[model samples]
Target: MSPAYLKEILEQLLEAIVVATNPSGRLISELFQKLPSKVQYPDYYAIIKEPIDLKTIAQRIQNGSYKSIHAMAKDIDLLAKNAKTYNEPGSQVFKDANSIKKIFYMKKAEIEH
Candidate 1:
């Protein structure tokens, strides 16, 4: 997939993470307000800053672990063979902000502003 498509997938996955974390069936806006600040990563910082049930924690762990083992392996294996996807943001480790900047056509003004 292209970088644009990968970005959309990343966004959707993040939204799902937030939805799964909020068990009170809270309003989307309220959930945003309740989200913890001053954390390294929003997706996982909740576990450290808040009181999450063990089940919820395990569920998140399983979800991450499953993807970590399979999805990452697939992406990495392909990356080793296909230089085309080296620049694409299909996997978090394979392509990062630096890779995007180096391989994609982006304006310095866009990044700065």
Candidate 2:
């Protein structure tokens, strides 16, 4: 089955919501927001401070775990196996804690702005 990552990515990208400005690249850029999870574990950093690969955090959602996509993907090796499903983001090992929190705490930040 197709992974939910693609649809989620499409929706977020159409809105041009990165951290700073509207990312003007392509697929990989949108995925950047959730990359952190692949690099480190859940408690790697206290708080994320940059773009994150949204695609890298899908697994945490499946596992019901938490991770930072940008931080982990930053440290991940250049080469790795594909996830069980593309919808899994980078791998099944990440979840964006702050982003999830912002859903309620920072509604303004929730729109992919």
The local distance difference test score of each candidate is 0.34, 0.34
The TM-score, computed over Cα atoms with residue i paired to residue i, of candidate 2 is 0.22
lDDT of 1 by residue, 36-109 (tens): 34464454443333332223323444445323323422332332223223234565323332232232122222
> Cα deviation of 112 in candidate 1 (Å)?
34
Candidate 1 least-lDDT 10 residues: 103-112
Alpha-carbon RMSD of each model = 18.1, 13.7
lDDT measured at residue 61 in model 1 versus the true structure, 0 to 100: 42
Candidate 1, 46: how far from true, in Å? 18
